[PDB]
Amino acid sequence: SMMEINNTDGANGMERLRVDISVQADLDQLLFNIPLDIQLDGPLRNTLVGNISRYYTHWSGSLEMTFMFCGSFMATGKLILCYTPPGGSCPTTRETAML
C-alpha cells in the first residue's frame, strides 16, 4: 500500500502520497528519506501493514518497499535506495548511505 512520504505542510491530500523529484543541477543529491516509525506517526503508519501491525505490540520479519516511477516515457534516471540498520544518525550523503 502507499506510504505518505510527502507528509509536509503545503502538501494536501494525495500530494502527500507522491514524492516529486526533478532534474538536478548538482551531483549525488539526496532526494528524501523515510522515517521507519510504525508506532510513532510517520509515512508508514497509514498503510495496510502499518495499520494492522498497530493492533499488535511485537513484530518480526522482512518488509519491502516498492517505488514506481511515474514520469514520462522519455524520462530516464538512476536512483539508489538505501536501508540503514540502526545505530547512528540518518545518513545525509550518498557515500555514507551507500554502505
Binding site: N7, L31, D37, Y55, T66, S89
Partner: protein
Amino acid sequence: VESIIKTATDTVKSEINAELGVVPSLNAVETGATSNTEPEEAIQTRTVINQHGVSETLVENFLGRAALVSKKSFEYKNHAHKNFFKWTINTKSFVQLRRKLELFTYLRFDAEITILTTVAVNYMGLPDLTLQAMFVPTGALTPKEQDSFHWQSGSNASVFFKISDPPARMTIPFMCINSAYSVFYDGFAGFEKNGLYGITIGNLCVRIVNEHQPVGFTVTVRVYMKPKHIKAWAPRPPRTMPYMSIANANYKGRDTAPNTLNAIIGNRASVTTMPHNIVT
C-alpha cells in the same frame, strides 16, 4: 496456491548473482500484483529456520475478543426510560469494535453476548436487583411499560440475572438471512427512492423486574459482543477519519493532523527531515 501455514517462512542462504535477463528486484506495479522479490534475491541471506508462530493473527483470534457494543444507564425509581429501556441493536456505536469489523466487507460469525450491570445510589447500601434482558426480533412488539404483558416472554428469548451473579452470557447464532453479514452495503433498504442508504437485527429490551424502591438508583447496563466461528471476506482500507454517525460513513476529519481530512499523517519539516533522528 492455498496451503497450511503454521509458522513464518524460513530463509535460505543465497549466493552472488550476475545473471542476464534475470532482474528479480524489478517489478511492475501497474499489474496490480504486489512485488514478488524475495529477500534471497535482493541481498545475500543466510539459512534461517523460522519458528515464529502465526496463530495470533488468525482472523478467529483477531476478531475473537469481547468488545463493548452497548452502554446504557437509567434511573431506577418511582416514575410518577421508566425502569427499562429498548435498544435497537447495532454494532456501529463504539469505534474500537466498529473499526475492526470494518476491516472486512463480509463476516459470518456466531455472537457471544455478555451483559454487565452496575448500580449506584442517588448511602444505605446497594440492592441486588433482578433484571430481564429480552431479545425482541424484528417485527415483534416491544414492551411499553416496566410491567407490560410483553415481558411474559412466551416465545422471545429472555434472560433473568441478578446484579450479584457473574455477567449474564449466551450465544447468538449467525442469524443473517444471507450467507454472511454485510459489514458494508452499497445500496438502499427499500424499493422506493426515499429509502435509507447503506445498512435489522431487532431490539434488546432490558428492565429491572423489582418494583421501585423508596429511593432512586442509577443502573448501567453494558453489553459486550465476541464473534466466534468466524469467516471473513474482502479486507478493506482501515478507517482514518473520526466516525460521525452510526448510520453512515460520513466524515469530517480532526481539526489538526493527524487524521485531518487534509492530512492523515502529521507533518514533518520536509521530505529530508528525520523526525526522531539519533543525535549521538
